Amino acid sequence: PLIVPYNLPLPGGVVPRMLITILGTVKPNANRIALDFQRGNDVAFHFNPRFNENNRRVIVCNTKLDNNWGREERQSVFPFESGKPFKIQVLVEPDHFKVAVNDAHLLQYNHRVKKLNEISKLGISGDIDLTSASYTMI
Numbered sequence: 544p545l546i547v548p549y550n551l552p553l554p555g556g557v558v559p560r561m562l563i564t565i566l567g568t569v570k571p572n573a574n575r576i577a578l579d580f581q582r583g584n585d586v587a588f589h590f591n592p593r594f595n596e597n598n599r600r601v602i603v604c605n606t607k608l609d610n611n612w613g614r615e616e617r618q619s620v621f622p623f624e625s626g627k628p629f630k631i632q633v634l635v636e637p638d639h640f641k642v643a644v645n646d647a648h649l650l651q652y653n654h655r656v657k658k659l660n661e662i663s664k665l666g667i668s669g670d671i672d673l674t675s676a677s678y679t680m681i
């Protein structure tokens with residue numbers, strides 16, 4: 544597969560109509576996964592499934608600016624399952640990132656970092672076997 548943590552360059556940043564697809568399998572007994580859309584050292588969009596936060600499964604989304612995390616956005620719809628294959632699709636829309644997992648809409652995250660063409664890397668980390676990571680225009 545691919546080595547995790549994995550860095551996927553996004554040449555020229557992101558733009559509306561760009562679709563990022565991540566395929567992999569959650570490890571048995573996973574604890575956490577993260578996708579980090581990065582603008583240099585800043586994290587424009589952190590998407591962070593947590594499998595055991597006080598015995599609850601939750602997705603935490605946030606932005607990191609100058610090494611400081613901001614206000615978390617939380618989603619208790621939790622489509623991941625330890626040991627199972629998944630597909631994450633992140634569609635860049637004008638106002639938000641739109642995320643679907645296994646072909647079901649999951650959440651939107653409003654753009655806090657607005658220089659979309661500087662969000663030039665995607666980091667993929669945590670407790671997965673990573674099969675592929677790619678992008679296309681729709």
Ligand SMILES: OC[C@H]1O[C@@H](S[C@@H]2O[C@H](CO)[C@@H](O)[C@H](O)[C@H]2O)[C@H](O)[C@@H](n2cc(-c3cccc(F)c3)nn2)[C@H]1O
Nearest residue numbers: 575576577589591603604605612613614615668669670
């Ligand atoms: O806000 C989002 C932020 O949250 C804190 S935790 C937070 O701490 C505060 C302050 O104490 C509490 O108030 C919050 O209640 C709690 O949520 C995580 O450490 C951050 N994080 C996770 C990873 C990571 C790395 C590799 C793999 C992976 F899957 C995930 N790297 N950094 C990030 O998720």
Ligand SMILES: [Cl-]
Nearest residue numbers: 575591592593
């Ligand atoms: Cl975490």
